[PDB]
């Protein structure tokens, strides 16, 4: 996690956050995504979803995983929840309520921990 990964998205245009890493065969991995809607604001963060899996590393066989948890934040606003997959978070129609800071954390059985911070804004509207 070097610094903020800035994402300029177009209005109602999808955005996909990707956290690329090479995992170790057999190690069990757990990922969490947290959303701070600080951009539209006008250790407590909203865990979007927590997932876990075990790396099979066949490079082709789509890896199964477990949806450990998912918050109901976006449903309280009657908006669709993000699509969370190993290493990626997807939003189909970017809107004001989706702007802000996304924090991705991955912890592995091998004793490894990795972070990644994203700042999703709008181009032409900042």
């Amino acid at each position, epitope marked *: 996690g070097q610094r903020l990964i800035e994402v300029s998205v177009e209005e109602n*245009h*999808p955005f*996909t956050l*990707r956290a*690329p890493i090479q995992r170790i065969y057999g190690v069990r991995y757990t990922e969490t995504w947290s959303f701070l809607p600080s951009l539209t604001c006008t250790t407590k963060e909203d865990q979007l979803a927590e997932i876990s899996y075990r790396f099979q590393g066949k490079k082709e066989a789509d890896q199964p995983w477990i949806v450990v948890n998912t918050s109901t934040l976006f449903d309280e606003l009657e908006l669709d929840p993000p699509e969370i997959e190993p290493g990626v978070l997807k939003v*189909l129609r970017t809107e004001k309520q989706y702007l802000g800071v996304y924090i991705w954390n991955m912890r592995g059985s091998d004793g490894t921990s990795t972070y990644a911070t994203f700042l999703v804004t709008w*181009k*032409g509207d900042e």
Partner: antibody
Amino acid sequence: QVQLQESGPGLVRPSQTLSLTCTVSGGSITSGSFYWSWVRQSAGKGLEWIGRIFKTGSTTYKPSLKSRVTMSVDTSKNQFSLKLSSVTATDTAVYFCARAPFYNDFSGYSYYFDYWGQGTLVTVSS
Amino acid sequence: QSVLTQPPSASGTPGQRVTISCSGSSSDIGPNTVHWYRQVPGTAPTLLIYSDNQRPSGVPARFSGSRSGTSASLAISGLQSEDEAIYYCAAWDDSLNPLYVFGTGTKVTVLG
């Protein structure tokens, strides 16, 4: 297994409207993080990108063509469609449809064409 | 409307390492990634490299990519008769008027 096929080639008289459509096989355009896009290649003029559409209807057009280019999608028939207006003879090119993954990472915005379709020679000549 | 500058043609004998360059701006390649495509005459282009270094499944490891600042490059190590084609680079311009800028085109000719 993902296949893309365009409408047939033909003559278009200058200063009228060009319409092409691309049909997808091996899946549905409603899968995530995929832009359905059109590019073109006129012999001697290399590769030129026309535009992209998403399943939501959000589009992005090449700025030189925004005044004349329109794109539409149909998730019911897995079909994305392109309309170019006020066509000149220099618009004679092979028009390729393509699927494009897209994501933001610590490197930036990645947007590439992995599964292309074949081409159709649209000739704009009187 | 923009273009990514590429050598008009590269060449090498079978087994050499051939490099193709891709020069850009701070609105393309600079802030965003570079992707490399291969076109054999008569057939549509095929993806060779994505995300500056990542290879599609079926693309041999002798093809490599790199990016530094406003420029990017492709390496065909172990040049072979099959690698003779036109090579294009591309990147996204996220200006206020966004677009997908392609390259001029580079044709590798396998000599010898």
